[PDB]
Amino acid sequence: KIHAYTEGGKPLRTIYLPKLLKKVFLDVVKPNTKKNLETCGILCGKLRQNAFFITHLVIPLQEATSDTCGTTDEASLFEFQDKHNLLTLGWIHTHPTQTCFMSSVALHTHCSYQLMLPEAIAIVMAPSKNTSGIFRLLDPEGLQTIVKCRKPGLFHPHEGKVYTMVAQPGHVREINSKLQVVDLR
Ligand SMILES: [Zn+2]
């Protein structure tokens, strides 16, 4: 039915995302959005038959401003995932006031995830704008740009096109399946 490919011609296995996830993530983190604070989550799941299914939304121990968010204890994130045999399939964070786009920070974070898993996706929610997006870096050219990048500075620019929206429903298909939310905060 569906074969998705990167810019470099490598095949991408399908990721099945619960349609409820986006909505549910906004629900659980709504208090921070109120206080104009970003929140991040991890999309976790399993590989069955050359396709990935997102089964858990994990909210890690974190810190945030209206501009940023970041994990503060990846050790217990690891232990949880290791204990329950859960793959890191991507991640999600909010833009309480902003438009829907991948920031410099997000691109640097996601680059590493996508190198470790070419299908890895970054979801960004913009509640205030009532828009959301599912993104990934161009592969190989965007990954290359961010890998070589050594600019200090949280909101610095990059030159050239670096990321793109994931094509749905080819790479990511939103379905009608279960979801556990694990809040580690
Ligand atoms: Zn950079």
Curated annotation (Swiss-Prot):
Positions of the MPN domain: 14-144
Sequence motif JAMM motif, location on chain: 93-106
Range within the parent protein: 249 to 433 of 435
UniProt-annotated binding residues for Zn(2+) 2: H108, C149, H156, H158
Binding site for Zn(2+) 1: H93, H95, A106
Annotated site location: Indirect zinc-binding: E38
Gene: sst2
Function: Zinc metalloprotease that specifically cleaves 'Lys-63'-linked polyubiquitin chains. Does not cleave 'Lys-48'-linked polyubiquitin chains. Plays a role in the multivesicular body (MVB) sorting pathway. Required for ubiquitin-dependent sorting of proteins into the endosome and subsequent trafficking to the vacuole. May regulate MVB sorting through deubiquitination of ubiquitinated ESCRT proteins.
Protein family: Belongs to the peptidase M67C family.
Compartmental location: Cytoplasm; Endosome
Domain notes: The JAMM motif is essential for the protease activity.
Domain of life: Eukaryota
Name recorded for this polypeptide: AMSH-like protease sst2
